[PDB]
């Protein structure tokens, strides 16, 4: 046999990216997972080259990021490609996940692949939070204040886990030095979750937009889907280059170019744009303990979806009512981000309480009820009695 099939190391490459059987009908929505692998390589490389010039001490941190922007050769390219790269990493993941909601990729036999994905999403929110604090701007200091103080509401162990996270009695120098060291680590845990994620995909393969079997018509990966993946790679770099070189501070906040001052508070303390839907679910509950539980429950409610879909058909391609309610959920997620960037004011308090009910009701009340209705509607339209 060929050398690529007999060698211990090339056999894995051949089985995954050359000779892997693929369905012929998959569309460009199946190209987002290769982009997320390029995003992770961009972040790990640029961050390592900046870490050679960084200082994590609280009196040196802010001025070290300006030293990268002024004195380091090609240093402004490293940072802006890093800060805008993370916003592009989260936008491709929301599209990857919403694809699975639509075509039914969470259902059996791919339940374990969907559960390892939910773990990756948790570790990526954590990574992005820890690095935004390494800048030690004004949003970096007061964002760590209000988030670490939420674990004070846990009964009987709340005031001891907060002093243990901080390393003292406030967000201070032990806090910033340990946040940087954890921030280099977690990207390498994500890389091992990605390996486990691909292993769970190789045993059953990918689905297709029709939602039926693909074992009757298969084509290999090399030169059909290698060159179809190449189309979206060069569009990704082109749109990213337009932001790094012509509008490099549009997806950030101005107050983070002020150094952190614990005596002066800002007028509005908001996270980055991709944690705003979850920041608005927290403010909807008027009790401190129940708001922290509900914020985390909004991420783990994805795990009950394999059990509440009561349909005999996979995906939403041939489903009229499940199509309408998939897009209700999408635009409800965008309104939660808008509410999270507003002031606590009338009527933005009631608007965020109704919209956070529609988020939890989709997974638990709406899907099982209309999926049962659509089963019976297919039966009586054909069967004569």
């Amino acid at each position: 046999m060929a050398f690529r099939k007999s060698n211990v190391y090339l056999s894995l490459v051949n089985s995954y990216i050359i000779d892997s059987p693929q369905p012929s009908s998959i569309n460009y929505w199946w190209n987002m997972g290769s982009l997320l692998g390029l995003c992770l390589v961009i972040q790990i490389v640029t961050g390592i080259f900046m870490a050679m010039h960084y200082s994590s001490n609280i009196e040196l941190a802010f001025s070290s990021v300006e030293h990268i922007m002024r004195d380091v050769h090609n240093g402004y390219i490293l940072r802006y490609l890093h800060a805008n790269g993370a916003s592009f990493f989260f936008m491709v993941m929301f599209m990857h996940m919403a694809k699975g909601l639509y075509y039914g990729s969470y259902r059996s036999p791919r339940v374990t692949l969907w559960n390892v994905g939910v773990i990756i999403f948790i570790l990526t929110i954590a990574t992005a939070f820890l690095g935004y604090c390494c800048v030690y701007g004004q949003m970096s200091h007061w964002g760590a204040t209000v988030i670490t103080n939420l674990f004070s509401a846990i009964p009987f162990v709340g005031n001891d886990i907060v002093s243990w996270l901080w390393g003292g009695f406030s967000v201070s120098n032990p806090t910033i030095q340990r946040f940087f060291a954890l921030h280099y680590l977690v990207p390498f845990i994500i890389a091992a979750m990605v390996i486990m994620h691909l292993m769970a995909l190789h045993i059953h393969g990918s689905s297709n937009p029709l939602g039926i079997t693909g074992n009757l018509d298969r084509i290999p990966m090399h030169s059909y889907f290698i060159f179809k993946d190449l189309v979206t790679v060069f569009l990704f770099m082109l749109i990213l280059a337009l932001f790094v070189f012509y509008s490099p501070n549009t997806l950030g906040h101005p107050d983070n170019y002020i150094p952190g001052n614990p005596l002066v508070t800002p007028a509005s303390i908001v996270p980055e744009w991709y944690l705003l839907p979850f920041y608005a679910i927290l403010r909807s509950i008027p009790d401190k303990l129940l708001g922290v539980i509900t914020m985390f429950a909004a991420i783990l409610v994805l795990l009950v979806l394999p059990f509440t879909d009561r349909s005999v058909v996979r995906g939403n391609t041939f489903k009229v009512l499940s199509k309408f309610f998939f897009f209700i959920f999408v635009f409800n997620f965008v309104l939660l981000g808008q509410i999270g960037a507003c002031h606590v004011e009338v009527p933005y308090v009631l608007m965020g309480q109704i919209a956070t009910f529609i988020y939890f009701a989709y997974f638990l009340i709406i899907v099982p009820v209309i999926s049962t209705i659509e089963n019976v509607l297919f039966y009586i339209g054909r069967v004569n009695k």
Partner: protein, 99 residues
């Protein structure tokens, strides 16, 4: 910082090396702030002692007073040094300090 506040009635003047990037508006806000002091505040607002009215500042009461008047500098190249002209130059110089 103790001596800076002692000479400005308690207010601290910030460093200007990043003021263009650390404010919403950019060069359009720095310019409008300097050319935006009216010669009498609107009817009704009661200013504290030692503050001045500028409607581009959030709140409408700022510790800085007007500092730009016509022909307070003479330029080498011979450009007329009016109020709007001097403002256009500092805001262009300060953006270079940020970028």
């Amino acid at each position: 910082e103790q001596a800076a506040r002692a000479a400005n009635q308690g207010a601290l003047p910030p460093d200007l090396s990043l003021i263009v990037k650390a404010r919403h508006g950019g060069c359009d806000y720095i310019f409008s702030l300097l050319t935006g002091y009216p010669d009498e505040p609107p009817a009704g607002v009661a200013l504290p002692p030692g503050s001045n009215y500028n409607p581009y500042f959030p709140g409408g009461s700022i510790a800085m007073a007007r500092v730009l008047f016509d022909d307070m500098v003479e330029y080498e190249d011979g450009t007329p040094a009016t109020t709007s002209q001097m403002a256009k130059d500092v805001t262009t110089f300060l953006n270079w300090c940020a970028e």
